[PDB]
Design a protein around this nucleic acid. Structure first.
Ligand SMILES: [Mg+2]
Ligand SMILES: [Mg+2]
Length: 1208
RNA sequence: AAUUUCUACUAAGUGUAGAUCGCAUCCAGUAAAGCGGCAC
C-alpha cells in the first residue's frame, strides 16, 4: 500500500457550502406583499445603533468598578518604580508585581457587581431597557435575535483581560496611565517651587475643583483616583488648564513651566497627560471632509509637526545619554541613515559582546551565535550616547540625525504646497474619487509623507522603563507625537475606501419573522424551523413554510399521474453519549422498562467509563441494556437501521456510541405532488428557491467545483455518511449594488480580445452579451449549508507519529522540495530516498487541462505586467491590491499542483520554516503571501481530494487523505505537521550540490596586513601547468567561524568564469584564470613558482591586495546572474568532485528532470528536500517507540556533514 | 469578460481551470501570529 493509503477516515472536519438561492415563481411577490423582509433589514440598520448603546452601559459599568478600586499591589510598586532600578534581576521581582496590578483590575471587574449579565441574552432583554425611548425601542427589536451581537461580544470581553494587550483596560490602567503618573511625580518633585502660591492652588484648587489640592495628584496613593475618566480629565486639566465656563481660560501646570522660559535655561520637563480609555466608508463627501479637516495647515496634526520640528531642531540642547531608540527594525534603518550600512550597529554590538563572552581557546559555534543573537534581540533600546559610542569620530550621531529628521519635515511642507488647492474652502469634487485618479494621488502623497515621518519618529521611544531619560525632551515629544499617532487611523480608512471593489457584499440574515428559522433539516421539527429541502430531477430546492401554514407540506400525495418533487426527511440522533442515558433513564422509559438496579448503579457510579472504577462486564451490561432498549423505542428504531457489533467485542462504552452515532443518521426522500406545492407557492403558503451555482446550469459541461460535488454527494446512494448534512443553515439577502445599465458590456456579435498571450486563439465572438460583475446588479439570496466530514472516524492515531513510522520503514521514500526563487515564483524538486532528482521545474506557469487541450498561464509574466502597471501608476494603492490578489490567486493554483505530486509520488513535503529567515529582496513571493500559502496547503491536506477521481476511491471525494493536522498558528508552522516538514533555508542555495562545498571565508578587503594573513592562512597557492589552472588549497581550521564545515580541506581552482556586479555610472563579466595571469603579470609576479604565498605577500601597496581579494571573492561566488536575462542564473563551483570535474549549472540547463539542479532556484528547492532526507535518516536510526522524540532540526553542522558525505 | 465567493480566464459559446466555513492581521524576517465556528 502507499504510505498515503493509511490516512483516511482519521478525524472529523466541518465545512460550510454557499449557494445562490433563486426565488421561483410568485415567491418574490408574496415575500414583498407580506413584507417579510423589512423586519430583517431594519434590524440590519439599527444593529450599529444598538452596539453604541451596549458600549454605553459597558462604560457606565467600567466606571462602577473603577470608582470602587484601591490597588494594594501599587504602593510597593511606586517605591520600586522610583527605586531607580539597579537591575540584576532585582527588577524581576517587580516585573511580577506589575502583572499582579493588571491581575487585580481584571479580577475586580469579574469578581463583583453583576458583570455576569453582560454578554449573554439578558443584557438586551432587560438590562439595557432598565438602564437609560427612541433608544429603548431599538433594543426591543433585537429580542430572540441575540445572534447579531456574538462577534461583537467576543471583541468586547477582551476589554477586561490581564492580557497585556492594547485592548485591555488594565494594561491601560496600569501599563500606560500609571507609569505617567509616576513619571510626573518625579517631575513634580523637581519642579515644585516654580509655582506662585496665589498662582498655584488658588486658581486651580478653586476653578478646576475647590476640592482636594494640586499636591495630592502627585502622591502615589492617589493613583486609584485617576483610573476613571473624570479623574483623568481632572488630572489632564491640571496639566493642560481649563475653560472656566467663561472667558477665564485658567492656566495649567505646563503653561507655567513654559512661562518659566524667562530663565531661558529652561528645558525644565513638562508633565505628560494621562491616556483616556474606552474613517469615511460611506461617501466621497465624507472622505474628503476628513482629509480637509485633519490635515489642513491649522489642524492639530499639522500643529504637532511644527512642534516636533522645533523640538528636533534643538536636538543638540538635550542629553544624548537620556534619549533612546527602540530596538527592532528602527535599528537597521537608523544604522543605514547614520553610518551607511544596515548591520553596522549590530556589528559593533557583536564586537563588544564577543570580547566579554568569547573565550580565546573557543571557536564560534552555532549555539554561541544563536545565544548572542537572543541577547541582542532582548536588549530593549540604545541611547544616543551608546550609538555615538559606536560613532567613529568625524561623524556626529545627533547632528546627522537632525539633518535626516528635518529633511523629512521639509518633505511634508513641499508636499503640502502641491496639495494646497484641496484644502480650499472653495474646493469641490469634479469626479467620483475612484474615477478621480489625480486627486487620490494627491491625498496618498501627503498621507504617505506624514505617515513615514510619524513611523520614523516613533522609533525614539525606548519602549522601556529606562532609568534616566530626557524628560524635557520627552515632555515635548510625547505631547506632540500622540496627536501624530492619529494619522494611522486616517491613513488606513482612506486607503480601505479607495481600495474597495466597486460593488458591495453587504447583506443581512433572514429569519422570516421566526427566531428559530432553519435551525435544523434532518430533524422533524419542520412545523417549528419551517424550512426544508426539495429535489426535482437534477435540481435542488429550499422550501420555506409560512407560519400560518406550517403543516401545508405534511399532507401531500405521491402523485404519479405525471410529476413529483422528492421531499426531505433527514434523521439525526445527536450526541448518543448524552442522549441515550437521557432518554432511557427517563421516567416514562423507567415505566416502560423495569430497569435492573445493576444497570442504574453502573450508570450513577459510572463504572462503564474509563477512570479505573470501570468494570468491563458492567460496561457490557450497560451496552446490552441500551441495545435492547433500542429494539423497544419506536421513535428511533423506525428511523435508523441499527446494526450493532457483538457486545463482547466492544472495548468500552465509547466503542458502542460511535456505532450509534454512525448509524444514528439517515437521509432519504419522500414524494410530493408537483402541481400541489407549485400552487402552494402561488398562494403564498410556501416560498421556494432554487439552490444554485453555475455547475447547475444546463450549459455547464466542465468538471464541477469541489463544493458542488460535496453537496450532491450528500444525497448519493454511494455515500455512507462520510459527508453529512448539519443544522445551523442560514439564509441571507444581498441587495444589489450595481445598476445593470451601468455595467461594462461586450456586445454580442463583436469579437472580444483574449487576454492570455499564451492562448493561441486571439479573439472570441459570442451571440449574446457579456457583462462585467453581473451578479452584483441583482438582489441576491445566498444559502450557507453546514456539512460534517468524517464525523465517525475509524482510524485513530497520531498523524505525526504514523508519518515517522512509515518513513522509517520505507525503502525509497520520496520528497517534494518547494522553494521561493528569484527568477521563479515557486520552484519544485522531487527527490528519491537517496537524493537523486526525479523531477525539477519552475511553477511560473500553471498549465490547465480542459478536455485534451492544455493551455498555460505564465503568472510570472502577469506579475511582471502588473509591476510595470504599479510603476506607471506611481505605486498607487489599487495596483498594490491588484498585485496582492493576483498572488493569492496564484497560490490557489499551486495547492493543486502540490496535491498531484504528493499523490503521484506518495511524497512527503519539505517547506521553509518562516520563523527562521533572512528577507530576500530578490524573491517575489514575500513572507506574508508564503505564510498564507503554507496555511492553505495544511488546510487542503486535512482532507485532500482529487476531483477527477471516482468519489468512493481512496483520495476521491468520499475518501480524502488526511495527512495534516488542523492549523493552529503560524508560530505553529515549525517542525512537522504530518506529511509537511518545515526546514530552515540556511545554506540551501549557495552550496555546490555536487560537493556540498559552501564558501565560509570572508573576502572583503580590510587591511594590507589582514590580506597577508589571509593569503598565508592558505596551505598552498600554485599555478598548475597541465590543467592550466590556479590551485588554492585550504583548511577551514586556519580561518575563523568555519566550525560547521565537515570536510575541512578543500582545493579551490580558478576554472570557469563568473559574472561580476562591476558597477559603473551595473554589470560586466570576468574570466578567472585570465585575472590571475593578468594581475600577477601586472605586478611582476612570476606564477610558475610553487606556493606563491610567500611571494605574494612581498607586495607593497593596497592595489595588489585590494584586487587580489576582489578576485578571490568572485571565485567563491558560486551564484551568478545578469538580471536582464532570464536565461542564466547559474551555479558554478570552485571545487572538483571525486571524479574530478567541477559543477556548472549550465551543463544541466538542456536536459529534462536532470540528476543535479538546473539553475540556482532549483538548487534551493533541491537542498530544502535533502534536509528532510537527513531527517528521515534520523528516523531510520531510532526505535519505533522513540520516533516521536527524534529531532528534525538539522544544524548547520549536521547539514554540511550530510551534504558533504552523502554525495559520494 | 459571465462565478456561492476569489483569482486567472473565454477554455469552442450564457461558460473554463484551481481553490473556497467566518472575522482580524496584509507589511517590518527584532512588535502581533490570535477571536469565532466545529469538535472536546
Ligand atoms: Mg468547474
Ligand atoms: Mg475577474
Amino acid at each position: 500500500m502507499s504510505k498515503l493509503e493509511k490516512f483516511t477516515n482519521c478525524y472529523s472536519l466541518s465545512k460550510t457550502l454557499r449557494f445562490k438561492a433563486i426565488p421561483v415563481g410568485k415567491t418574490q411577490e408574496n415575500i414583498d406583499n407580506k413584507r417579510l423582509l423589512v423586519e430583517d433589514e431594519k434590524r440590519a440598520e439599527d444593529y450599529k445603533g444598538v452596539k453604541k448603546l451596549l458600549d454605553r452601559y459597558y462604560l457606565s459599568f467600567i466606571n462602577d468598578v473603577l470608582h470602587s478600586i484601591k490597588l494594594k499591589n501599587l504602593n510597593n510598586y511606586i517605591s520600586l518604580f522610583r527605586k531607580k532600578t539597579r537591575t540584576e534581576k532585582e527588577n524581576k521581582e517587580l516585573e511580577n508585581l506589575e502583572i499582579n496590578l493588571r491581575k487585580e483590575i481584571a479580577k475586580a471587574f469579574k469578581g463583583n457587581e453583576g458583570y455576569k449579565s453582560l454578554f449573554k441574552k439578558d443584557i438586551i432583554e432587560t438590562i439595557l431597557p432598565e438602564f437609560l425611548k427612541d433608544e429603548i425601542a431599538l433594543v426591543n427589536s433585537f429580542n430572540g435575535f441575540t445572534t447579531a451581537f456574538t462577534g461583537f461580544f467576543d471583541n468586547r470581553e477582551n476589554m477586561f483581560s490581564e492580557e497585556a494587550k492594547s485592548t485591555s483596560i488594565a494594561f491601560r490602567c496600569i501599563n500606560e496611565n500609571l507609569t505617567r503618573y509616576i513619571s510626573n511625580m518625579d517631575i513634580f518633585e523637581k519642579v515644585d517651587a516654580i509655582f506662585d502660591k496665589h498662582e498655584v492652588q488658588e486658581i486651580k484648587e478653586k476653578i478646576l475643583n475647590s476640592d482636594y489640592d494640586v499636591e495630592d495628584f502627585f502622591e502615589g496613593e492617589f493613583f486609584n483616583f485617576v483610573l476613571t475618566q473624570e479623574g483623568i480629565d481632572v488630572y489632564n486639566a491640571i496639566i493642560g488648564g481649563f475653560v472656566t465656563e467663561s472667558g477665564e481660560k485658567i492656566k495649567g501646570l505646563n503653561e507655567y513651566i513654559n512661562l518659566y522660559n524667562q530663565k531661558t535655561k529652561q528645558k525644565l520637563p513638562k508633565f505628560k497627560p494621562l491616556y483616556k480609555q474606552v474613517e469615511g466608508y460611506t461617501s466621497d463627501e465624507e472622505v474628503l471632509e476628513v482629509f480637509r479637516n485633519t490635515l489642513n495647515k491649522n489642524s492639530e496634526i499639522f500643529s504637532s509637526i511644527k512642534k516636533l520640528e522645533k523640538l528636533f531642531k534643538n536636538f543638540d540642547e538635550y542629553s544624548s545619554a537620556g534619549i533612546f531608540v527602540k530596538n527592532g527594525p528602527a535599528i537597521s534603518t537608523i544604522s543605514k541613515d547614520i553610518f551607511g550600512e544596515w548591520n553596522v550597529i549590530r556589528d559593533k554590538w557583536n564586537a563588544e559582546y564577543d570580547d566579554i563572552h568569547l573565550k580565546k581557546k573557543a571557536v564560534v559555534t552555532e549555539k554561541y551565535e544563536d545565544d548572542r543573537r537572543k541577547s541582542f534581540k532582548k536588549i530593549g533600546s540604545f541611547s544616543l550616547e551608546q550609538l555615538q559610542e559606536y560613532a567613529d569620530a568625524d561623524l556626529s550621531v545627533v547632528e546627522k540625525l537632525k539633518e535626516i529628521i528635518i529633511q523629512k519635515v521639509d518633505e511634508i511642507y513641499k508636499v503640502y504646497g502641491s496639495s494646497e488647492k484641496l484644502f480650499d474652502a472653495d474646493f469641490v469634487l469634479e469626479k467620483s474619487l475612484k474615477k478621480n485618479d489625480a486627486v487620490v494621488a494627491i491625498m496618498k502623497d501627503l498621507l504617505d509623507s506624514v505617515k513615514s515621518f510619524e513611523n520614523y519618529i516613533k522609533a525614539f521611544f525606548g519602549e522601556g522603563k529606562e532609568t534616566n531619560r530626557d524628560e524635557s525632551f520627552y515632555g515635548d515629544f510625547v505631547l506632540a507625537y500622540d496627536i501624530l499617532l492619529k494619522v494611522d487611523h486616517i491613513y488606513d480608512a482612506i486607503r480601505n475606501y479607495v481600495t474597495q471593489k466597486p460593488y458591495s457584499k453587504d447583506k443581512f440574515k433572514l429569519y422570516f419573522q421566526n427566531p428559530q428559522f432553519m435551525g435544523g433539516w434532518d430533524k422533524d421539527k419542520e412545523t417549528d424551523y419551517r424550512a426544508t429541502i426539495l429535489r426535482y430531477g437534477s435540481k435542488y430546492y429550499l422550501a420555506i413554510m409560512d407560519k400560518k401554514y406550517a403543516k401545508c407540506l405534511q399532507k401531500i400525495d405521491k402523485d404519479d399521474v405525471n410529476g413529483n418533487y422528492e421531499k426531505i426527511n433527514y434523521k439525526l440522533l445527536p450526541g448518543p453519549n448524552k442522549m441515550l442515558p437521557k432518554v432511557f433513564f427517563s421516567k416514562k422509559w423507567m415505566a416502560y422498562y423495569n430497569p435492573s438496579e445493576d444497570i442504574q448503579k453502573i450508570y450513577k457510579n459510572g463504572t462503564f467509563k474509563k477512570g479505573d472504577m470501570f468494570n468491563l462486564n458492567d460496561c457490557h451490561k450497560l451496552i446490552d441494556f441500551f441495545k435492547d432498549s433500542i429494539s423497544r423505542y419506536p421513535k428511533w428504531s423506525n428511523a435508523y437501521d441499527f446494526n450493532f457489533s457483538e457486545t463482547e467485542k466492544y472495548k468500552d462504552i465509547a466503542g458502542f456510541y460511535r456505532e450509534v452515532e454512525e448509524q444514528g443518521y439517515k437521509v432519504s426522500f419522500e414524494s410530493a405532488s408537483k402541481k400541489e406545492v407549485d400552487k402552494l407557492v402561488e398562494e403564498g403558503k410556501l416560498y421556494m428557491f432554487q439552490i444554485y451555482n453555475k455547475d447547475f446550469s444546463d450549459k455547464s459541461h466542465g468538471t464541477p467545483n469541489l463544493h458542488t460535488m460535496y453537496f450532491k454527494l450528500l444525497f448519493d446512494e454511494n455515500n455512507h455518511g462520510q459527508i453529512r448534512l448539519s443544522g445551523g443553515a442560514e439564509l441571507f439577502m444581498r441587495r444589489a449594488s450595481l445598476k445593470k445599465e451601468e455595467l461594462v458590456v461586450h456586445p454580442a456579435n463583436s469579437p472580444i480580445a483574449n487576454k492570455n498571450p499564451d492562448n493561441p486563439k486571439k479573439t472570441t465572438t459570442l451571440s449574446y452579451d457579456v457583462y462585467k460583475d453581473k451578479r452584483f446588479s441583482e438582489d441576491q439570496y445566498e444559502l450557507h449549508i453546514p456539512i460534517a466530514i468524517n464525523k465517525c472516524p475509524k482510524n485513530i492515531f497520531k498523524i505525526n507519529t504514523e508519518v515517522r513510522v512509515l518513513l522509517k520503514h520505507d525503502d525509497n521514500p520520496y520528497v517534494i522540495g518547494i522553494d521561493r526563487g528569484e527568477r521563479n515564483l515557486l520552484y519544485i524538486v522531487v527527490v528519491d530516498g537517496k537524493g537523486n532528482i526525479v523531477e525539477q521545474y519552475s511553477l511560473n506557469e500553471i498549465i490547465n487541462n480542459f478536455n485534451g487541450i492544455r493551455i498555460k498561464t505564465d503568472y510570472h509574466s502577469l506579475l511582471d505586467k502588473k509591476e510595470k502597471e504599479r510603476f506607471e501608476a506611481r505605486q498607487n494603492w489599487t495596483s498594490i491590491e491588484n498585485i496582492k490578489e493576483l498572488k493569492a490567486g496564484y497560490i490557489s493554483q499551486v495547492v493543486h499542483k502540490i496535491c498531484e505530486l504528493v499523490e503521484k509520488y506518495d511524497a512527503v513535503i519539505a517547506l521553509e520554516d518562516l520563523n527562521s529567515g533572512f528577507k530576500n529582496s530578490r524573491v517575489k513571493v514575500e513572507k506574508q503571501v508564503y505564510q498564507k500559502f503554507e496555511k492553505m496547503l495544511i488546510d487542503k491536506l486535512n482532507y485532500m481530494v482529487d476531483k477527477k477521481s471516482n468519489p468512493c476511491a481512496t483520495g476521491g471525494a468520499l475518501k480524502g487523505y488526511q495527512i495534516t493536522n488542523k492549523f493552529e498558528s503560524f508560530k505553529s508552522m515549525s517542525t512537522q505537521n504530518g506529511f509537511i516538514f518545515y526546514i530552515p533555508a540556511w545554506l540551501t542555495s549557495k552550496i555546490d550540490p555536487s560537493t556540498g562545498f559552501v564558501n565560509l571565508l570572508k573576502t572583503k578587503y580590510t587591511s594590507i596586513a589582514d590580506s597577508k594573513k589571509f593569503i598565508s592562512s592558505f596551505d598552498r597557492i600554485m599555478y598548475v601547468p597541465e590543467e592550466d589552472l590556479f590551485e588554492f588549497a585550504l583548511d577551514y581550521k586556519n580561518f575563523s567561524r568555519t566550525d560547521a564545515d565537515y570536510i575541512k580541506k578543500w582545493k579551490l581552482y580558478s576554472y570557469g568564469n563568473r559574472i561580476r556586479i562591476f558597477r559603473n555610472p551595473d554589470w560586466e563579466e570576468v574570466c578567472l584564470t585570465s585575472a590571475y595571469k593578468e594581475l600577477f603579470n601586472k605586478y611582476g609576479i612570476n606564477y610558475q613558482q610553487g606556493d606563491i604565498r610567500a611571494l605574494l605577500c612581498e607586495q607593497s601597496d593596497k592595489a595588489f591586495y585590494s584586487s587580489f581579494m576582489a578576485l578571490m571573492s568572485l571565485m567563491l561566488q558560486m551564484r551568478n546572474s545578469i538580471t536582464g536575462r532570464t536565461d542564466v542564473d547559474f551555479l558554478i563551483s570552485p571545487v572538483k568532485n571525486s571524479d574530478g570535474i567541477f559543477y556548472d549549472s549550465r551543463n544541466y540547463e538542456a536536459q529534462e528532470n536532470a540528476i543535479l539542479p538546473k539553475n540556482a532556484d532549483a538548487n534551493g528547492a533541491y537542498n530544502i528536500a535533502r534536509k528532510v532526507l537527513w531527517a528521515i535518516g534520523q528516523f531510520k536510526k531510532a526505535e519505533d517507540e522513540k520516533l516521536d522524540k527524534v529531532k528534525i532540526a538539522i544544524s548547520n553542522k549536521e547539514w554540511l556533514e550530510y551534504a558533504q558525505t552523502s554525495v559520494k
